[PDB]
Structure 1
Amino acid sequence: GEIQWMRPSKEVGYPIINAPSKTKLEPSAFHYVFEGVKEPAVLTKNDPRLKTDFEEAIFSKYVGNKITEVDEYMKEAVDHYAGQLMSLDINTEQMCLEDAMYGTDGLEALDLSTSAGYPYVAMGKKKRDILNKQTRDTKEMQKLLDTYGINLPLVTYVKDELRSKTKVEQGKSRLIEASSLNDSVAMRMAFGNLYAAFHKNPGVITGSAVGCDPDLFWSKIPVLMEEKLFAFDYTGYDASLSPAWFEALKMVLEKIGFGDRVDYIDYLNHSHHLYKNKTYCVKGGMPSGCSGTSIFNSMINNLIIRTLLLKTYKGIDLDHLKMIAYGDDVIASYPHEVDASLLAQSGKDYGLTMTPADKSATFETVTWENVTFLKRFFRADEKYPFLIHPVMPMKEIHESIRWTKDPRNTQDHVRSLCLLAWHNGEEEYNKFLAKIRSVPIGRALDLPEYSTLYDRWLDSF
């Protein structure tokens, strides 16, 4: 991805967008009961913590576009992946505005907590005014879709979340490129059935984990993998994507019955943005807040790994490439060992920066002992080894519980962390519960005991 031009939203007739200047993150009742080194991310150029220019930092992710055309390897990757998807017999029909807005089997209803994007964010209109579960009314939106249409600018917000100290000082805050409710609805109508097929089929056929449930899915992953695992991390995956990867994605879509609406992908690729009082154009780069961002990033990851394997290992048998991606995150395998270091070198030629899996200093063998996916390890259960525990490190949980955005959501936030924490074992969990109950707020929460979580987990399969 690369910014082609940036200038005053007024010079081009666009309104200034208001972006909160203060974080909603404040120390929680457990701030001092647990150890943690993370702080709220810089949300403005004035933040006393900044040790470098803010604007430069937040846009530095667009490192450029490395490749221009879809080469031979990419085309073969396209053919093979499209070939796999065809076996799912995905309903290629468009989705009725109704299901597209209020959900249906395989597709949750639009989230009312997220921005409605332009122009509504300048007209002060909110999603709650437009839709409404009860009636499941198309009327109002149908009306807004004729008035403003689609292909509207993307509203860019700085993500309000916890970041390391070093990323605070370097203004390395993440951005949320929010789309208009119009486009969000259009695409869900256009690709809704695609989204649903993926959500209902996490695994090695879709090569996607989007919409999965770790508690159950972790037990199926080892079975789906080939003998030898390989992985690696991406630096700025989304922003590094070149236009060619979007073209390859369009090729896959056309091959499975959606050439009908591949123009939509063009907007993800060549995108128009509004940030503050500025407007900019980006060539390439997957926008963070669009409908289908996760699934399209996962599909592209499936094309990328295939491409890098074909380019590095002529004769490779892709039918035995067993991989599962969640956006840029991926867990993959092959019957024979492969060199992630080599794959990484080929990656640069495609505009991708790959590094040792999980911040390793060097590319080392990936094992069931050290592999992670969605930040979780894999640990076979002591009593029933065929059941696999997705193990989220307690450090992650400790960082999260030390902060809050809404004291009214304390119960849900803490309960959620408990559903992640117990997998670390009964001893660890009870210590976690003990610390939570060492302060008044914690003692008033309705939290599940270990035995209860464990027995319910055993019964869920």
Structure 2
Amino acid sequence: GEIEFIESSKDAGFPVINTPSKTKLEPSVFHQVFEGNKEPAVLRSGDPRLKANFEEAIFSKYIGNVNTHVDEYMLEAVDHYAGQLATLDISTEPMKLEDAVYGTEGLEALDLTTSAGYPYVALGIKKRDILSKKTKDLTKLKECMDKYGLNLPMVTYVKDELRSIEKVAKGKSRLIEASSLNDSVAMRQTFGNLYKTFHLNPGVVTGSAVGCDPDLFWSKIPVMLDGHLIAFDYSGYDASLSPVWFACLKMILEKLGYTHKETNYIDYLCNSHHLYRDKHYFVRGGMPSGCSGTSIFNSMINNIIIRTLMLKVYKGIDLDQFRMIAYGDDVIASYPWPIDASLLAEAGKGYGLIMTPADKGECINEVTWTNVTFLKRYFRADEQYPFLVHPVMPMKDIHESIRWTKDPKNTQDHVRSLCLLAWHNGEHEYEEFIRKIRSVPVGRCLTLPAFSTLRRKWLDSF
């Protein structure tokens, strides 16, 4: 992706978008009990912790586009993945408005706490002023969609979240690109059944883990991924995407039965108009992280990408023996023969992608079930039930999270959610976690599950 045009919003008649400039994150009562290094992301240019230019830092992810046609490797990659998705009988019929807004199996209700986007944010109109959980009212929403239409600017927010020392200093805060309520609803009508099918079928046919529950899903992953593991991280995946990858996505969608017109919303994602505080800008390429479907669409594109690279480097490859699972940029995969991920990564550079294989690196001469990670978690087979696999979030990451809060009123929910992650690290680790929690008076006011209870519920869940 590449920023093609930026100018002061007032020159185009847009008001300044007044977005949060000060973090909601504050040290929790556990800030001194546990160790950590992370701090709230930089949200504004004047932050005294900056060791770089903020506005340049947050937009540096837009590294450019490779301008190429959909080549022979991409075409075969699209065909192969499309054949898998054909197995799922995805409906391209529009999803009913009420189902797409207020909830249905496989598609949770539109989140009422996130930004309604433009123009609502300039008018002080919130999602709850238009929508109502209790009534499922669609009347005001239909008025608003008729009144303002579709293809509205996206509003860029700086994500308020903990970041490493280096990412604070470098100003590498992440951005959230909020679609207008109008476009979110319209995309959920157009693609809602696709979203539903993906959410209900995480695994190696969708090649997707979007919506998965790691407590359940991680025992299935080694059954699905039979061979020599391959795994990748990317640097700035979303913003690195060039328009050719969106063209591949449109081709895949059409093979699923979507009309050319129904794929027009992919152009809205690819060639996109954004408002950031007092500026507005156009991007050619780049997935606007935060719009409807971006995790699922990122995952589908990653399925095309990896196949393309394998086809290009290993002309003799058999994709029918390849398996992969993606969550956006994150990939875990396998093939029955060893594959040199460093060759795939160099091939990816020719397509405008910045890939880092999970193996060396170093300390990792070979990706194994011992050292591979997915969604930030390791894999550890249970010692007693070897066919059940624990997702293992590192205790260091849990410690980082528990030391801050965006609202101490949610302490009970926050700590409990962390307990549900922590116990997979083992009983001694969990008991120490609980001891430290209880070393602050708040900690003794919380309902904390016992280890044996967490283990018993986990075993029973299968």
- The alignment's TM-score, normalised by the length of structure 1, stands at 0.99
Q: Which runs of 4+ in 1 moved over 6 A?
A: none
Partners of 2:365 and 2:281 in 1: how far apart? Answer: 41
Q: How far apart are 1:359 and its partner, in Å? A: 8.4
Partners of 2:306 and 2:317 in 1: how far apart? Answer: 12
Query: In the alignment, is the contact (CA less than 8 A) between 1:356 and 1:362 conserved in 2?
Result: no
Counterpart for residue 32 of structure 2? 32
Partners of 2:128 and 2:448 in 1: how far apart? Answer: 31
Query: In the alignment, is the contact (CA less than 8 A) between 1:241 and 1:351 conserved in 2?
Result: yes
**In the alignment, structure 1 residue 282 sits paired with structure 2 residue 283:** yes
Instruction: Judge which range, 91-100 or 183-192, deviates more.
Output: 91-100
Counterpart for residue 445 of structure 1? 446
Q: How far apart are 1:408 and its partner, in Å? A: 1.2
Counterpart for residue 16 of structure 2? 16
Query: In the alignment, is the contact (CA less than 8 A) between 1:67 and 1:242 conserved in 2?
Result: yes
**In the alignment, structure 1 residue 309 sits paired with structure 2 residue 310:** yes
Counterpart for residue 63 of structure 2? 63
Q: How far apart are 1:123 and its partner, in Å? A: 0.3
Counterpart for residue 334 of structure 2? 333
Counterpart for residue 354 of structure 2? 353
Instruction: Judge which range, 302-311 or 83-92, deviates more.
Output: 83-92
The 5 A counterparts of 1:23-422 are: 23-259=23-259, 260-357=261-358, 360-361=361-362, 364-422=365-423
Q: Which string of whole-angstrom CA distances, capped at 9 and with x for unpartnered residues, describes residues 88-134 of structure 1? A: 01122101110110010100001111111000000011011111111
Secondary structure at the aligned position of 1:6 is classed as strand
Secondary structure at the aligned position of 1:272 is classed as strand
Q: Which amino acid aligns with 1:77?
A: A
Query: In the alignment, is the contact (CA less than 8 A) between 2:28 and 2:405 conserved in 1?
Result: yes
Q: Which amino acid aligns with 2:195?
A: Y
Q: How far apart are 1:232 and its partner, in Å? A: 1.8
Secondary structure at the aligned position of 1:343 is classed as helix
Secondary structure at the aligned position of 1:94 is classed as coil
Gaps of 5+ in 1: none
Gaps of 5+ in 2: none
Q: How far apart are 1:168 and its partner, in Å? A: 0.9
Q: How far apart are 1:143 and its partner, in Å? A: 0.7
Secondary structure at the aligned position of 1:69 is classed as coil
Secondary structure at the aligned position of 2:326 is classed as strand
Query: In the alignment, is the contact (CA less than 8 A) between 2:208 and 2:325 conserved in 1?
Result: yes
- The alignment's TM-score, normalised by the length of structure 2, stands at 0.98
Partners of 1:227 and 1:274 in 2: how far apart? Answer: 46
Query: In the alignment, is the contact (CA less than 8 A) between 1:341 and 1:363 conserved in 2?
Result: no
Secondary structure at the aligned position of 1:193 is classed as helix
Q: How far apart are 1:327 and its partner, in Å? A: 0.3
Q: How far apart are 1:423 and its partner, in Å? A: 0.3
Secondary structure at the aligned position of 2:331 is classed as strand
Task: Summarize the Cα distance change of 1:172–1:358 in structure 2 as closer, same or farther, 3 Å threshold.
Answer: farther
Q: Which amino acid aligns with 1:437?
A: R
Q: How far apart are 1:67 and its partner, in Å? A: 3.5
Query: In the alignment, is the contact (CA less than 8 A) between 1:369 and 1:378 conserved in 2?
Result: yes
Q: Which amino acid aligns with 1:132?
A: S
Q: How far apart are 1:363 and its partner, in Å? A: 7.0
Partners of 1:306 and 1:289 in 2: how far apart? Answer: 26
Q: Which amino acid aligns with 2:24?
A: K
Query: In the alignment, is the contact (CA less than 8 A) between 1:130 and 1:141 conserved in 2?
Result: yes
Query: In the alignment, is the contact (CA less than 8 A) between 1:226 and 1:320 conserved in 2?
Result: no
Q: Which amino acid aligns with 2:291?
A: C
Partners of 2:346 and 2:363 in 1: how far apart? Answer: 14
Partners of 1:437 and 1:252 in 2: how far apart? Answer: 53
Partners of 2:288 and 2:359 in 1: how far apart? Answer: 24
Q: Which amino acid aligns with 2:188?
A: R
Q: How far apart are 1:361 and its partner, in Å? A: 4.0
Partners of 2:176 and 2:360 in 1: how far apart? Answer: 24
Q: Which amino acid aligns with 1:113?
A: T
Secondary structure at the aligned position of 1:386 is classed as coil
Partners of 1:92 and 1:167 in 2: how far apart? Answer: 41
Q: Which string of whole-angstrom CA distances, capped at 9 and with x for unpartnered residues, describes residues 325-346 of structure 1? A: 0000010000111000100010
Number of equivalenced pairs: 461
Q: How far apart are 1:226 and its partner, in Å? A: 2.5
Partners of 1:164 and 1:200 in 2: how far apart? Answer: 34
Query: In the alignment, is the contact (CA less than 8 A) between 2:360 and 2:366 conserved in 1?
Result: no
Q: Which amino acid aligns with 2:226?
A: E
Partners of 1:347 and 1:217 in 2: how far apart? Answer: 29
